[PDB]
Design an enzyme around this catalytic site. Structure first.
Site, PDB file in Angstrom:
ATOM      1  N   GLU A   1       0.787  -1.213   0.000  1.00 13.48           N
ATOM      2  CA  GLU A   1       0.000   0.000   0.000  1.00 13.48           C
ATOM      3  C   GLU A   1       0.830   1.278   0.000  1.00 13.48           C
ATOM      4  O   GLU A   1       1.537   1.578   0.966  1.00 13.48           O
ATOM      5  CB  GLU A   1      -0.946   0.023   1.208  1.00 13.48           C
ATOM      6  CG  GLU A   1      -1.670   1.360   1.362  1.00 13.48           C
ATOM      7  CD  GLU A   1      -2.688   1.378   2.499  1.00 13.48           C
ATOM      8  OE1 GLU A   1      -2.539   0.599   3.461  1.00 13.48           O
ATOM      9  OE2 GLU A   1      -3.626   2.191   2.430  1.00 13.48           O
TER      10      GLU A   1
ATOM     11  N   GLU B   1     -12.022   2.522   4.925  1.00 13.52           N
ATOM     12  CA  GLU B   1     -11.053   2.772   5.989  1.00 13.52           C
ATOM     13  C   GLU B   1     -11.025   4.280   6.168  1.00 13.52           C
ATOM     14  O   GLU B   1     -10.263   4.998   5.511  1.00 13.52           O
ATOM     15  CB  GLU B   1      -9.658   2.276   5.625  1.00 13.52           C
ATOM     16  CG  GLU B   1      -8.687   2.476   6.780  1.00 13.52           C
ATOM     17  CD  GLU B   1      -7.276   2.077   6.450  1.00 13.52           C
ATOM     18  OE1 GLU B   1      -6.696   2.654   5.500  1.00 13.52           O
ATOM     19  OE2 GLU B   1      -6.740   1.185   7.147  1.00 13.52           O
TER      20      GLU B   1
END
Lengths: 259, 262
Positions: free
Chosen positions: B143, B237
């Site tokens: 990520e 998120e």
């Protein structure tokens, strides 16, 4: 509405000269400088240089007084906070020579484990002290994103504090790079700031020169026109792409096209 | 065939987990995403039971706290700590194996720490290859994170470069809109470059609030996701804003659901 360029200088004359000449060459109407401690610089030469190029200095940055010397307007240590205030006072004397604005960015300090209320009140006290120590100086509070501070992240935060300071000598400095993160709807935030919007900083979403990211500058400039913004739009971005000079040229080109 | 998942915050645990999973189910999410510092101190059989009772799979496991709390880094200058980081991640994969979940390689990869980007990247590639030799079924997702969280792997292109060097389909990319809003020049184009490498997706608005409460352009992102055939998870998120954990999760779902269905 006027365009200015923020120029980086060492902790100096060489960098300043180059920066101002670059700004002139590109077409900027004014320049913005940032200095840690002004007492070591000969501003008389600076004024001469300025007069020479017919290039005003719109604002003076104070961020390094914090990043380098740890000076904060909300520092828990009173002797340090007093020194922070005295340092900013010297920044105002420099600003007074050019009729420039004093930027209150990171120099305001962080919460450092304290409540937002204690930090804010201490900040208000320092600002009021600065207004007492200086007569004509004008300050601009710059909301910064969450990664740089936990004290004053949004334009609405600033407005609320401006109401507590209650002085037209203190306004707001909005920055597109920071608003891209903290502001819900930028156009609406600027409209709420309205006349309280004293200064403006521009850089793209990646903080590169405007036009090299994905920030919506069109909507911003349409709003600025609508509220009758007739102050400065200062380019404050990383030397990307291609370096300090190329960035300045690119930024000027995209911003000019929109003004 | 895109699916929706909700990332649930858990204290370093059963209580938070159940409430988070029941919230996700009630809102309509098809799966949840969790994050744990050290998997060894958790009874995962109870977690699997809960997952089965609620018919809520766990699609991904975060490992960021292993770094933030324990200082473990896959590129740490101290080889001893680097090995421990690898050993900690192996334990995350053991847990991931019980759920068929992806393992997220976020902050656990570490920062440059005054070193060249080349050395940091080489150390990372070495740690990922070691991770692959150590696991038979685990799948990892790198990520990219914004400049304030790290100076190592900030963009999708950074990750893509690394993936070509690792050369394993068991390692892919996890792109996050909040981070891309800062680091990516043109998000739709970035996503097309990732293409098949896009294994997981994180969603949050420009201010990291529930999608729809900022100014991030999700419409274009989803058009590109469709164009690239992305058919895996879109996991929420975001901060528990506005109005708290439940409200945020609800608003997020509604925003995403409409973008998808259309």
């Amino acid at each position: 509405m006027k365009l200015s360029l923020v120029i980086s200088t060492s902790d100096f004359k060489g960098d300043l000269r180059k920066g101002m000449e670059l700004a002139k060459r590109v077409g900027y109407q004014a320049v913005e400088i940032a200095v840690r401690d002004p007492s070591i610089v000969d501003w008389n030469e600076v004024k001469i240089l300025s007069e020479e190029l017919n290039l005003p200095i719109c604002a003076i940055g104070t961020g390094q007084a914090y990043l380098a010397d740890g000076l904060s307007l909300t520092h828990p240590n009173d002797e340090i906070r007093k020194k922070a205030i005295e340092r900013v006072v010297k920044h105002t004397e420099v600003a007074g020579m050019f009729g420039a604005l004093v930027i209150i960015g990171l120099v305001r300090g962080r919460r450092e484990g304290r409540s937002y209320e204690e930090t804010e009140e201490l900040f208000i006290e320092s600002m009021k002290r600065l207004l007492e120590l200086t007569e004509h100086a004008k300050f601009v509070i710059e909301p910064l994103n969450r990664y740089e501070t936990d004290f004053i992240n949004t334009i609405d935060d600033a407005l609320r504090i401006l109401r507590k300071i209650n002085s037209n000598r203190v306004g707001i400095l909005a920055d597109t790079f920071h608003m891209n993160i903290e502001e819900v709807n930028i156009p609406e935030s600027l409209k709420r700031a309205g006349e309280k919007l004293y200064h403006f900083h521009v850089a793209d979403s990646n903080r590169w020169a405007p036009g090299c990211g994905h920030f919506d500058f069109r909507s911003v400039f349409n709003t600025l026109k609508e509220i009758g913004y007739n102050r400065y739009v200062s380019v404050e971005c990383l030397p990307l792409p291609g370096g300090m000079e190329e960035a300045a040229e690119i930024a000027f080109k995209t911003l000019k096209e929109l003004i």
